[PDB]
């Protein structure tokens, strides 16, 4: 007989995390995924989130897509959901004042590229269709380095796309950049660290870095602070320990597995994959696009890995 959530919950005397605990985008199962193998589009580089590349659909599975960077190694391929805000139709860059990195080898033109590759651009209607109030390119703020999360750092808004904006760490590598929205718990107004008595990491190689002063720095750069009213942090999530859900595997991202909430924080949850070592457990933001309610895989046509049996 087929594995099912209902039988498993019975066997385990367990419960699922209710759909209400998830963002609409994590829960939605009734959208069609119309993307097809070989279709071309634009998207951010996950490793360099400020940069936009030409991407090809290399695989379709349920409501997910594997994307390939045209011209580059297969090593760089990555999976997104079809409702990702990180992908856009051909021509988006030109329409929105962004720069498009060319395919490896490449003067660029979408019409000639499509002819050369005998390919079709993913249609505009295959993509899911308001600016973040108070966040504009060039404004400054304080932000948690999510790669070094004990550090709150001098940061800037360097891009704005739809309802989100890009946080960049002043004079640090752009690999530390990340997109977020005005409710992120990782961002704060200029002056927050002083107010909390926490140390603030200044821009890389700032002269006399112990005497870093926001007033002086804003004078040096002519930049404004993001206004305090703009920051609208979200309430803690309501996931509880032992609730079950579905989560993308971190070792092999093609796979999605049966998962449990092992531990919680205000804004994160710790995932355990049922049946596997606790050594694989990992923390993830509660709004991460790769966690889903029970039944997401079944409703979207994606295989679900059942728990590893004893």
Curated annotation (Swiss-Prot):
The chain holds residues 272 to 588 of 840 of the full protein. The gene is L3MBTL1. Coiled coil: none annotated. It comes from Homo sapiens. Changing residue 153 to F/R: Strongly impairs binding to monomethylated and dimethylated peptides. Widely expressed. Expression is reduced in colorectal cancer cell line SW480 and promyelocytic leukemia cell line HL-60. The record marks 148 as: Positioned at the entrance of MBT 2 and is required for recognition of monomethylated and dimethylated peptides. The lineage of its organism: Eukaryota, Metazoa, Chordata, Craniata, Vertebrata. Changing residue 176 to L: Abolishes binding to p53/TP53 monomethylated at 'Lys-382'. Changing residue 148 to Q: Strongly impairs binding to monomethylated and dimethylated peptides. Abolishes binding to p53/TP53 monomethylated at 'Lys-382'. The L3MBTL1 locus is imprinted. Paternal inherited gene is expressed, while the maternal inherited gene is silenced. This is Lethal(3)malignant brain tumor-like protein 1.
């Amino acid at each position: 007989e087929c594995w099912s959530w209902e039988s498993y919950l019975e066997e385990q005397k367990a419960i699922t995390a209710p759909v209400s605990l998830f963002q609409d985008s994590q829960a939605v199962t009734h959208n069609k995924n119309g993307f097809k193998l070989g279709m071309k589009l634009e998207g951010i580089d996950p490793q360099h989130p400020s940069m936009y590349f030409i991407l090809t659909v290399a695989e379709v599975c349920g409501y997910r897509l594997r994307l390939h960077f045209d011209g580059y190694s297969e090593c760089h391929d990555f999976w997104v959901n079809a409702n990702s805000p990180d992908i856009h139709p051909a021509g988006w860059f030109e329409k929105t004042g962004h720069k498009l990195q060319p395919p490896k080898g490449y003067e660029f033109s979408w019409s000639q590229y499509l002819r050369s590759t005998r390919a079709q651009a993913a249609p505009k209607h295959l993509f899911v269709s308001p600016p973040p109030l108070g966040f504009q390119v060039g404004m400054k703020l304080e932000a948690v380095d999510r790669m070094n999360p004990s550090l709150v750092c001098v940061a800037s808004v360097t891009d704005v796309v739809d309802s989100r904006f890009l946080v960049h760490f002043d004079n640090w590598d752009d690999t530390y950049d990340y997109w977020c929205d005005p409710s992120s718990p990782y961002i704060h107004p200029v002056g927050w660290c002083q107010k909390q008595g926490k140390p603030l990491t200044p821009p890389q190689d700032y002269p006399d870095p112990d005497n870093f002063c926001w007033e002086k720095y804003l004078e040096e750069t002519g930049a404004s602070a993001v206004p305090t009213w703009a920051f609208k942090v979200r309430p803690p999530h309501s996931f509880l320990v032992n609730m079950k859900l579905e989560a993308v595997d971190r070792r092999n991202p093609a796979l999605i597995r049966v998962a449990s909430v092992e531990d919680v924080e205000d804004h994160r949850i710790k995932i355990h994959f049922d049946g596997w070592s606790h050594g694989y457990d990992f923390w993830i933001d509660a709004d991460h696009p790769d966690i889903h309610p029970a039944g997401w895989c079944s409703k979207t046509g994606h295989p679900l890995q059942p728990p590893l049996g004893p």
